[model samples]
Target: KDGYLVEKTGCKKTCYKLGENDFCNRECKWKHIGGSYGYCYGFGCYCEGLPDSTQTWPLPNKTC
Candidate 1:
């Protein structure tokens, strides 16, 4: 029998990590905040998923 081509799960990173169907969690999200080492130009929370968007590149914008 033939098998289906599906992507694997369980990737690691240092950011917001929400549930599979959850909207980016605190650890998994790129959470834009006030500071010098921020990614966003202004300020806001970046709801970024794992192995997905880069820092500020996708820009979630959700302020904390």
Candidate 2:
């Protein structure tokens, strides 16, 4: 799998993603059942999922 930015209906975030084919058959299936929409774009699976409301942000001074 690989990491990619996923654009969803309510939000966009990074996720560990599968290939296009498997993502469609597997990843997207659970996402749909979990009360969200899911699909594939390029090498990653895009999820129309919710965000973690309690998650905190990091300081801007952090570097890559």
Candidate 3:
């Protein structure tokens, strides 16, 4: 459904998956300077769930 960035010690990489959700159980290899910023590797638009943002509203209401 979407792709998320898995930070590493040197560089960042992306993980692609379906069903509108994805997760990385391993630690990041790079430092995530952009935090939750990532690209959608799938054909459809990516949907990421922020820490405190509601499913309907993922922006201004989102928390760090």
Candidate 4:
């Protein structure tokens, strides 16, 4: 069985992310491990999970 899931996470907001839910454990170069070097905001999207009214959603330029 296969279902679709879109995961997303980031810094002080949620450092954790769905970056690990991709088609593979590795993406661009970051391997999907709970506490691996591959999970740094330095390599992926780092949203602050802020309120929509406060800031724009999907802040792709954020980093750790």
- Candidate closest to the true structure, highest lDDT: 2
CA deviation > 4 Å runs, candidate 4: 1-42, 57-64
Whole-model lDDT values for every prediction: 0.26, 0.37, 0.30, 0.30
Query: Candidate 1, residues 1-64: lDDT per residue as tens digits?
Result: 1111111232222234223312223332323322122111122223322233234332233321
In the order shown, the candidates' Cα RMSDs to the true structure are 15.8, 9.4, 10.2, 13.0
Among residues 3 or more apart in sequence or in different chains, the pairs in candidate 2 whose N, CA or C atoms overlap within 3 Å are none
The number of the candidate with the highest TM-score is: 2
Worst 10 residues of 3 by lDDT: 50-59
Error of 4 at 40 (Å): 5.6
As a whole number from 0 to 100, the lDDT of residue 56 in candidate 3 is: 14
- Taking all chains together, each candidate's TM-score versus the true structure is 0.16, 0.30, 0.21, 0.17
RMSD (CA, Å), candidate 4 to true, equals 13.0
Q: State the lDDT of candidate 4 residue by residue for 3-46, as single tens digits.
A: 11124543333234545433222332232223222222433433
Query: Rank by lDDT, descending?
Result: 2, 3, 4, 1
* Model 4 global lDDT (CA atoms, 0 to 1): 0.30
TM accuracy, model 2: 0.30
Q: Candidate 3, residues 15-59: lDDT per residue as tens digits?
A: 454333334322211233222423344432233432332121112
